[PDB]
Design a protein around this ligand. Sequence first.
Ligand SMILES: *[C@@H]1O[C@H](CO)[C@@H](O)[C@H](O)[C@H]1NC(C)=O
Ligand SMILES: CCC(=O)Nc1ccc(C)cc1O
Ligand SMILES: CCC(=O)Nc1ccc(C)cc1O
Length: 338
Amino acid sequence: DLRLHLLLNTSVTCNDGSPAGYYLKESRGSRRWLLFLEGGWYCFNRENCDSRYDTMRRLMSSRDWPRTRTGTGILSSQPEENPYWWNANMVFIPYCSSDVWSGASSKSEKNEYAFMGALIIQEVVRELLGRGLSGAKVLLLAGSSAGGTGVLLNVDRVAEQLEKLGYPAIQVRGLADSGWFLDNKQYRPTEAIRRGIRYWNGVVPERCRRQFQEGEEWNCFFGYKVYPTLRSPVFVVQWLFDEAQLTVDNVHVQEGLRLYIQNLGRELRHTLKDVPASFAPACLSHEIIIRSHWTDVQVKGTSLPRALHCWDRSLPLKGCPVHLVDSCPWPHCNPSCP
Ligand SMILES: *[C@@H]1O[C@H](CO)[C@@H](O)[C@H](O)[C@H]1NC(C)=O
Ligand SMILES: CCC(=O)Nc1ccc(C)cc1O
Ligand SMILES: CCC(=O)Nc1ccc(C)cc1O
């Protein structure tokens, strides 16, 4: 069980002005810290944010949050469920800003909602330093779906924040699960992000911002575009036939669709060729790292917990690989798929 703490700085808020927070379970005999970012789509104007507030309110407010949360997958403390980091300090950061963890805008007279995803991460880190994070050796910033993209947008800023606070010794790294998307042609969305960024006053990494410049920062929400600008080590997990990707592509089997799906897999694999730390099975699914049975999937005989342990050691190893991308071209040609 992870225990809830609302932010002491009550000016850092969820969408409706309620305080943000984090769930925490300490492990005093460990110097490893895992901060995990929840996912759950987003909203990009007044009308569809109002809709989200009726039926997805826990993603917009902390007023109904429970006081505890059970750790699962990589957030589990039992070695049988989490062979990778079962003894680490666990943090679950709920997604209540609807901004893909990019916003830095307060609720005001001109703003019905607050979008403070980028500032929530910074404040969580800042308050955790007083509860044990000051002595860490590694801070792994992880996340799934919208949280995965949020890892890519924020990992370097967390490194920069800790350097400027006087903690150069803490090693900051990223783990992006199911947040690596392609701006491909649909079978039958870039505007939504561009409109959202203006709505949220969203921010992107600076390298990436200086490459693409004004009006074009939506490009930095796409993994294959923002990854080469990052300096912190980042491990990328992505299903080759992601359900969220296919949904936006309006895919729900004849030649046309066969060639479409086969081409999606080949392009995704291409974008990962120069990503040295990656795990990409040929499956139709979405998210993995906090699922309880995340130990079952394997690429070329290597599980995801093993690949992550090999990454720890790397920071070329005999029989302990870090780059694992399937080569077969159809969903669930890998027998270990969910
Ligand atoms: C609380 O957070 C806000 C937004 O980041 C910041 O302006 C303010 O200075 C913070 N308060 C304290 C006491 O640090
Ligand atoms: C689950 C929410 C979601 O998918 N958000 C999202 C949208 C566009 C891009 C490029 C990356 C993203 O992470
Ligand atoms: C080229 C038109 C377009 O926007 N395509 C697109 C498809 C899927 C996702 C997730 C994001 C996308 O941007």
